[PDB]
Design a protein around this ligand. Structure first.
Ligand SMILES: Cc1c(C(=O)Nc2ccc(N)cc2)cnc2cc(=O)[nH]n12
Length: 164
């Protein structure tokens, strides 16, 4: 079935717990596969050790820039960027997992977990999964954001991988 992956997240070096994400490979297989492999690190790079560098309360928590750790970087398992696979899944509410981008067809590795419905991102960001477990962790992460996105704690994906 669809991959289940996990992010174990620290804030200021103490574990918040685990976010478990279902990757909707049945809808966006290429996008799901990218994220899955970045979680396992099996291509030799990925999210382990990277940060939630942009967190906006009542919006989303964004992570995945494992190259520059600041929102300018990241890369996919396919190359630096890959196309928007489709926009079929919508930003329906908290827990939606969606690809950050810098315009059309600029998916890399950065992603965000919504903490609200973000319908204006429909058709602009490829949704590719959702939180199965650990919304409490997401809410913790969110609580360390700010309007500017700057985090008030260092939020680190200390471990990540695939559960199934
Ligand atoms: C809009 C934005 C991004 C972003 O989405 N960047 C981006 C996404 C995907 C790819 N492939 C390359 C760059 C990352 N960090 C921050 C901080 C901030 O205040 N805004 N912001």
């Amino acid at each position: 079935g669809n991959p289940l992956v996990y992010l174990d997240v620290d804030a200021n070096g103490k574990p918040l717990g685990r976010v478990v994400l279902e990757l909707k490979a049945d809808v966006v297989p290429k996008t799901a596969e990218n994220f899955r492999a970045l979680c396992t690190g099996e291509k030799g790079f990925g999210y382990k050790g990277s940060t939630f560098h942009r967190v906006i309360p009542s919006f989303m928590c964004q992570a995945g820039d494992f190259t520059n750790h600041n929102g300018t970087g990241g890369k996919s398992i396919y190359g630096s960027r890959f196309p928007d696979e489709n926009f079929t899944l919508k930003h329906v509410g908290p827990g939606v997992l969606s690809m950050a981008n810098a315009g059309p067809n600029t998916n890399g590795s950065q992603f965000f977990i919504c903490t609200i419905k973000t319908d204006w991102l429909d058709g602009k960001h490829v949704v590719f999964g959702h939180v199965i477990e650990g919304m409490d962790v997401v809410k913790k992460i969110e609580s360390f954001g700010s309007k500017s996105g700057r985090t008030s704690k260092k939020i680190v994906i200390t471990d990540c991988g695939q559960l199934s």
